[PDB]
Amino acid sequence: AYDDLHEGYATYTGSGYSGGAFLLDPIPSDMEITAINPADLNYGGVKAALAGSYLEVEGPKGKTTVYVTDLYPEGARGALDLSPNAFRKIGNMKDGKINIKWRVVKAPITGNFTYRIKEGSSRWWAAIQVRNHKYPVMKMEYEKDGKWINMEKMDYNHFVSTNLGTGSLKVRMTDIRGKVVKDTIPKLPESGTSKAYTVPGHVQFPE
């Protein structure tokens, strides 16, 4: 049902390159991005399910793939708020709003995951974001005392949990198609950090 084609309208703005709700900065100024309505955003009951995903959008002039970096506040289902460069390729900007058909598509990237640890994170409370993923990340779990604890995905595109444990963290993430992948990131600090930081990933969802 995730591959299903979506129908809606699209507008444009230049607000997703910086300060987007999904905290995916920095976004290359020349990239094709988009803001997505709240309904479609939270797919499968998981908040920000499509955050960081890539959509293939088709307008009256053609198709293009966009990177979901922000939320489209009060937007209706199927509604998208594309960046100028993306909108211009599938439609006429002088039209202000265009009809579209889109669907989630494999991320046109290379490499493995990259994790972002939000400020204030530690072994007591942590928010961990997954970046550079081929498909949308549904669910993320970490291992503690031989058990896999499930982390709740938040609106700010980060998986949160408390009492993460000690030592390096063993995590496992599942995509929108049920594909699972395991990895291990360095230990979390003993006190909430002042600034967020990134940590390299060693895995990726299957093609």
UniProtKB/Swiss-Prot annotation:
Subcellular location per the Swiss-Prot or TrEMBL entry: Secreted, Cell wall
Any single Gene Ontology cellular-component annotation: extracellular region
Domain Expansin-like EG45: 33-102
Keywords for the protein's UniProt record, in alphabetical order: Cell wall, Secreted, Signal
Function recorded in the entry: May promote colonization of plant roots. May cause loosening and extension of plant cell walls by disrupting non-covalent bonding between cellulose microfibrils and matrix glucans. Has very low expansin activity (in vitro). No enzymatic activity has been found. Binds to peptidoglycan and to plant cell walls.
Protein name (Swiss-Prot/TrEMBL): Expansin-YoaJ
Native organism: Bacillus subtilis (strain 168)
